[PDB]
Design a protein around this nucleic acid. Sequence first.
RNA 1: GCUGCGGCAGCGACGCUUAUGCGUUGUUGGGUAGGGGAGCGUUCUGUAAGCCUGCGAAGGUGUGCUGUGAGGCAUGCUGGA
RNA 2: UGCGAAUACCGGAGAAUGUUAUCACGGGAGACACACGGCGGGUGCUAACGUCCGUCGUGAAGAGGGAAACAACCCAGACCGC
Lengths: 140, 58, 103, 117
Amino acid sequence: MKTFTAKPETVKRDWYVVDATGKTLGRLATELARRLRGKHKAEYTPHVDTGDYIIVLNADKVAVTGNKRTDKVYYHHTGHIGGIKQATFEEMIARRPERVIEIAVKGMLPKGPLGRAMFRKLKVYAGNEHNHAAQQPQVL
Amino acid sequence: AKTIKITQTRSAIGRLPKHKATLLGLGLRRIGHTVEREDTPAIRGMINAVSFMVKVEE
Amino acid sequence: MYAVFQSGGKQHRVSEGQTVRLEKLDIATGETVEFAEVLMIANGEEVKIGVPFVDGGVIKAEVVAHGRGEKVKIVKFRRRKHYRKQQGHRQWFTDVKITGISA
Amino acid sequence: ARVKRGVIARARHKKILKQAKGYYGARSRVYRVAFQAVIKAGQYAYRDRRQRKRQFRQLWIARINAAARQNGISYSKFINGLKKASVEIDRKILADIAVFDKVAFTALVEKAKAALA
RNA sequence: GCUGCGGCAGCGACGCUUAUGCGUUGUUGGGUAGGGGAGCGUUCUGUAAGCCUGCGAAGGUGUGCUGUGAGGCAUGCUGGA
RNA sequence: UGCGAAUACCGGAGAAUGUUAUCACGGGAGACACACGGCGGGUGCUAACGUCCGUCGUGAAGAGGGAAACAACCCAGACCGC
């Protein structure tokens, strides 16, 4: 018959907990981006709706390799003309890891709709274990 | 010599005059197409222009 | 037991499944002649003995059923440049069914 | 001495106008659609069916690369093990074994892992 | 692109069969101007006070089968010659 | 220019290969705005998606893959279906 496993509409979701307190920073994104798609996954034919479910912790412990601790363009221009452009170096932004840096995965995903389905939907935080505002249940 | 059994190299239309030397000459059409010619000196002449070009393997 | 083979495309994933395929040759009509496939068998693959090969001893084939070898399908498929249009065309096959006994 | 085009006139427009989907606005209601759109459909169709053979292959390997590697040896090494055989070569497509016969598949990764010289 | 499998058409061959033709095979089949070659369909004339029709024609609209395509047919409904 | 290639061109034999591809005569043509890339050059500033010759290839009249997206560059030339 037509081979292609269907799209059970994001059938299963395996929960996980990275550490981010590591030393890989930017390298980690890939195995973080591959995961929310169909990396470790075999069946659940990607391309179509899908994903997984992992979560970041502190993450505040990153340095990148070279002097990237001091670079990284970063600007979040707005629909304001009048000459805006908000450039802030990485360390300048690392003061409060928000929608960026830890969120380096967004630029690594299919982008637009559906990819957008995974997006921040992995949670980030910046303090590891304490009062996990996130779902405490099953994780690895 | 070395001409007995030669399969075309791998190239569409790009040459200028060598095509007569091969496809229109030797008798090769489409890549991979192999031809087996005799094993006398006279033939080496064709493969020479297309030395590293064509593929004669064994 | 599972099934497996090529012949005009590796179409042999399903077990018995009775799925279309290709065509005999001289003619199609039904009935049969009892044509065993070949030991492309995944060892049949199906039991406590799923095997990497498929090769799990000599001779292992299923007999072809020859359910219904007819029909077609029609697909327009027409190209056109800016000055022409081959738009007008059609090429199909009948893919004989075949139910296939057991492995 | 009568063209009286009316006679096939209708049949032709009606023919292409027969785009069930309706598509959108003028794309059904107006004859304008036909050679503009009904024609595009023929074009977009012409290439997709044949270009599709690979789009699935890209998926087939996308999952094999995602299934076989989890249990040692990447897709790059996999087919290489598999590559060595006298009869052992059953292609992909059915390669989706990772979805129904996992045991088979993982029993097939050894056919390659242990196979790789 | 090449290979595998099926199918279409032209030409050379092969197997025969033998007006001929079909199965195997080698090969050729991108294409504007343009050349050549085949065809569909429409109005009107012959074949036609023959054949189809009010136990429903042409026309309009749906559907199903069919041809490589132009189109072909069968039929639901409308329809009123 | 007291020397001088490659090489293109000329004619002679020879094997093989290519569904006479060669030539002549006759019916119908279209076509004389070409553009880019490589090599050899006039020009121009070894400027120009410049301009004028030569030659080869592509586009024109080629779809597909490739250089993010790029008619001309690279690869490869689309009878149909899988």
